[model samples]
Target: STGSATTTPIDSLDDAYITPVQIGTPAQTLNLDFDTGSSDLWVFSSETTASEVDGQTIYTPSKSTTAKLLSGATWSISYGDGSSSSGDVYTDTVSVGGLTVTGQAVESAKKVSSSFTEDSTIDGLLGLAFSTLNTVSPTQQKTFFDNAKASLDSPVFTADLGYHAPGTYNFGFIDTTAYTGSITYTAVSTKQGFWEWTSTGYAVGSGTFKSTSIDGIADTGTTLLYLPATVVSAYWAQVSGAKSSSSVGGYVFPCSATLPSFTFGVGSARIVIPGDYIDFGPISTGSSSCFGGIQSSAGIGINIFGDVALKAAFVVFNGATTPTLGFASK
Candidate 1:
């Protein structure tokens, strides 16, 4: 989720570390980022030094009594924001919410940069969104789901992201109390990394482009949702006298009136992004002008379904049995 936009520091910090739950045992304490956009679980190892770490989390193997080490396999990652990390491979027992998973594949970083090591609040990330984008190597490792299936009473795994409070990520049997109606299941694409699916298309002003489609890949690691310039301008243009500037590196609109609602067609369902989510945060212009959450990532080639869109509902990433996504109420 650390794509192109400037990262907003998490304020009023809380101790929200996600532990790994090994099979049949209590959840072992582990630090992780609840990443939904990607399908990989990465952690720091005993070999990593403090000099290489930046803002990313570093999982200390010495902290976990059940930790295991991998000797030869090497791992590396290049993020869309142009950040990268690499290290050796290891295995260990991990836990989350009292559930335990044994033989979890872990990446031990002997050398990390300042961008990853400097952060204290965010120790590591957990990619629990989907299986298509799973980061597990060996090309056969069944991520958290594969290890938790037998122990889980239900076929589903739920992610309850506490918004702006304890900021905790919950997993386990899906809770039916979170939603009001029947859940919708979006088809998972047969691709690599994240499960990227295209929208029917987009409508700007009164003109609709059937070819100009949008892709939605749920991502917990990111803080905001991004869009292309053409679509962004067109959608905002629906409001009379609405204008945008790049001083903030994305779209910005005046605050005189509430912005128009933008609709996203997700296969069979229609999702509406309200004006509040579009115009969030402090006004860059200092007047009534509001900052838009949807930015212009024109050439980035990928679109992420960040927290703004995800916080409203409950999600299930069905990787325990196979690669599938189950949508339900919180």
Candidate 2:
């Protein structure tokens, strides 16, 4: 996944997101913030600031005979968090899950920020989201997927996100064990680079779409399913005895009653986001009780279905032929 950078009304918040995978023998599995917004792979070099390298997996290319420099290319990236890193471009055999895309172009940052130096468990990020945001030019190189796509049996890629679990970021074909036999797929819209649609509204249990005035987008990069505040409050109101409580800075329910079943209706797929996934944890400064799942992105331009909602379904990112995305189940 590619990292995100928010600007003006749209603030980027991709930081400290970790993917549990690494670069060498016995393969030091490091945590990385996988972003679907950009395409490129990078890790902190041993030469980075100690603070930045502290908990990160700093790759010592000199120590590994397999690492190769990409001639005269140089690499530098400034993340949405204002942190920065810069180094020489290189190539090495990178592996994830059962797939190993050899000769993967990478950037080794020699200069990194304190954020990169402070973390301990994981090292850097593996950007597998989309190729449009990639920093690499076609004249210079092809992306990891660009080379590996032909080998993929289905000519498709799915992100199986274990959002709360360690090492849960699994990528490959959609795992069949997760859903029903027939995969429900939606072709990507050509306009927005994201998987988009005009949502008619939601359906809870046997409830019909009472309001046809609904629209939104789905994003794996986001952490929660953001909804319009009015709709969110209404949905919670239907939860029998569900009393609204404001704590930890987010809206939450105090009632122990069983919440209603819900689904977001796209043209073909009705994205089911259970109540448990909607009500969040207790609120706190900088943290809201809605942290558990769906949130209120009241003023935002678009509603996004982040990882919390994505985990429940099998999503295929197909940029191979149509420059479009496909969402289906296993």
Candidate 3:
């Protein structure tokens, strides 16, 4: 069977997209960030500390008749940005859109970092990465996608992440009307537990595209686009008054400066990012300084094509034999 769902951007923060998911027998719904960078379905639960709960909704496993504890099992995960959570495991019925997976392992958080606790609107995270990356101890857990794939008519999912607008996440089927032009496909290497691929090269504005061959991951959880320092520097050089600022962090430039368009090549397909999108809002409201959407991936080692980059195209996360990424203009 095929399943489809719409994802909406959180208020003011276009950094991440969230989809509603139901868990347990009576079905407690939670707005979860569908992250492609990590694997593990975790939620703020009754076990979480009161002080850390904030205003986010918490899941109560005892209330669900279908919930069953996996004796002595636990899970813990930490993200690259330092957000973390850990707790005991329980198998429960989980559903997204029209797809449902029975006895899916749900991590009930006993501890959450300030990054997560402080985000009162985010109830939890639904990991879409390969199950091999799951953090469940003793026995690893499978993601909702992995468990539902066998029943799907097609092993595929599409992400239509939009800029400051609602988008759709389609499973087991692709909606042709969502994209324009032809869809270009490229082989992806999942050895790193990420949608990793090599881009032929990049260019600033309408300049000739060079052949840099940079490896990067398509991460929905990440907010901004991150690239090698050399490449970032090259892009910044094209923007007048742009500079790498230590205080502001990342490359910043005058908000009024005319920024150049950036493009990255996937096989023969070129994905172009408009200059306005590069201006990731002002450094401070009404301030002349603006934080760049593209930053250096020096510490992270691998570049990240985050929301800023992914939203520019319709992305197909094909789970078929030899996973591939298909990109098309929106």
Candidate 4:
């Protein structure tokens, strides 16, 4: 049988989607953020400092009969957003959807940053990147997909992300109904531990397309689309009142300002991001200033096609030998 799973976004924050995962004996369920940019399955647990965990659920390994400590093993990770976490390791049974993997490495957090502590709804993160990116000390760990791929009918997964709506993440199967049109395939460069690819060009609204290769990663954990400074400037210039505000941290415009659709070329295919989607909500609570979802990847070494860009297309992270990326209109 093919292993598969469905993920849904939280109504409160559309930034990320959470999928249910079972770990340890008797099955302790936790809602996890499936991140494709990093590799490491880490969760808040009894091992985490009490003060560091706010309203988030904690995983208790001691309560699981099948849980075993991986003595002397530990993991620490820091994200681009400055959020970080560290923890010890445990081996246990882990199941996603109907597929189960025995002896899976589970990282239990002993510390977490303030950002994670404030994000109470997320119980943990499930990394889907290449196993080489795993942060476990002395020895890296395999992701849930890596450990279960041998049993899968096909080594592939589809990310059907929606805008402010629920979508699905399918493993070992692709639901044709989830996408329309032919999927444009592109070779991925996984040397960076991410599903990184290069786009041939881009255009703003009805403007002429500019041919310039942009290397970026398809990151589900990231909430916004990040590109080079020049690209961001060109897009913002199309908006009448768009401006960069230090307080806002990025480009912001009047809430009523009209926005032009942005398009990025993937090989011969063009994926269009609707203008409205570019308006990433208000800059502040009850403020008339709106921030653009597309921002500058200034500090970060590479661009990131985060949820803002991913939601605009149907993405297939194929796990074949070459690891290709397939994109199609939703």
Q: What TM value does model 2 have?
A: 0.72
Residue 264 error, candidate 2, Å: 1.7
lDDT of 4 at 284: 76
Arrange candidates by TM-score, descending.
Answer: 3, 4, 1, 2
Candidate 3 positional error at 50, Å: 0.8
lDDT of 4 by residue, 161-268 (tens): 878777788888888888878899998999989999999889999999999999999999888899999999999999999998888799999999989999999998
What tens digits encode model 3's per-residue C-alpha lDDT throughout 167-268?
Answer: 888889889999999899998999989988888899989888888898999888888999999999999999889999989878999988988989999888
Worst 10 residues of 3 by lDDT: 9-18
lDDT of 1 by residue, 1-330 (tens): 001111122442211224332311232334466566554566654466766655444456665666665555666666666655667655777666555567876666665555566555455555554454554354534566556666666645655444444333444565566565666666666465674566655544234544556766766666566676677767766766556665665566666666655655555555555555555654643676666666665777777766655554556665544456655434
Write down the lDDT of every candidate, Cα atoms only.
Answer: 0.56, 0.56, 0.90, 0.89
RMSD of each: 6.1, 6.7, 1.2, 1.3
Cα displacement (Å) at residue 161, model 4: 0.8
Clashes of 1: 46
**Per-candidate clashes, comma-separated:** 46, 27, 0, 0
Instruction: Give the TM-score (vs. native) of candidate 4.
Output: 0.97
**Stretches of candidate 2 above 4 Å error?**
1-29, 71-87, 110-119, 136-142, 163-174, 190-200, 204-207, 210-218, 236-261, 285-292, 298-301, 323-330
Q: Relative to the unseen true structure, what is the C-alpha lDDT of residue 122 in candidate 2, on a scale of 0 to 100? A: 42
Best by lDDT: 3
